Amino acid sequence: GSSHHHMKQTKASFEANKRVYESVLLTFRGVDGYDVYNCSVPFFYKGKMHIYGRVEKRDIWAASHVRLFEETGKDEFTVVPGFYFQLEDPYVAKINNEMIFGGTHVRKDKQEISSYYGYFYRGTPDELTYFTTGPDCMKDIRVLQLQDGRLGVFSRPRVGCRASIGFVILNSIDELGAEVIAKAPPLDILSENTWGGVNQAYLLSSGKVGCIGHYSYEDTDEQQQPQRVYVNYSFVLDPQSRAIADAKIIGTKSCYPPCEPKVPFLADCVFASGIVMRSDGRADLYSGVGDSREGRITIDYPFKVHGTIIGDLNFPMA
Ligand code: NA
């Protein structure tokens, strides 16, 4: 698809000191011959765990779609007939008891990518209605509902080697559009020669925002081959002061079971999906692995000092 054609020391510390309690790859049924990866966070609908997956052949020129899957066994998901989107990298949020769903839409002219943008949909998994679009050539836009009911919006401008995560508060999802996302001011998250993005935002009991995302940079492996490193990253935003706290690596490719990446320069790449709280007080971190599989690791809850999650991703029928 679109992506395929100091943190280095922080990562080496993480690789030495990591606490991983469980480690699996997900099995997907019903889409044989496609890879499934870079999913949404899992959510609940009709009493069942579901996830949206990015569905794409291994070939770097193959185009992505998104399908809905339902949990049919432990770490086993079966495609739900009847729901397709022409998108990459799907993601979900709950705003006023409604699903907001998004993905990256790729526009082509004479078999080459001409533009891409975030498409946003609202409703429930049985019927999602496309309603707004992000700015030209931006991805990694994410929303959540804040403690006062307003809409937090994360942007992610990226032009060559200049990238930032931005953030703006809107009154409601009815204001979400290209110009307000484009004008979101920067947050102090990404360093020079790095990139990254929010994948899933959570409202915490303190009123702060717990972010699960990715942090990325260029490196060279032991065999002196190029790698675009992607790590699972967390931080906590204070939406009033805009201060960033407790920024840290929470997962890396070595945490998940071994698997072939889509291309050789994604051998140390994981693209976060989100966390699900467990019966044992730990977090299940779901992630894309090598732009080819979806994995799950059990980790310490990454927002302990800033509070527990407010609300859930259990979606009511319309
Ligand atoms: Na991407």
UniProtKB/TrEMBL annotation:
InterPro entries: Glyco_hydro_beta-prop_sf, MPT-1-like_LmxM. Coiled coil: none annotated. It holds the Pfam family DUF1861. This is DUF1861 family protein. It comes from Leishmania mexicana (strain MHOM/GT/2001/U1103).
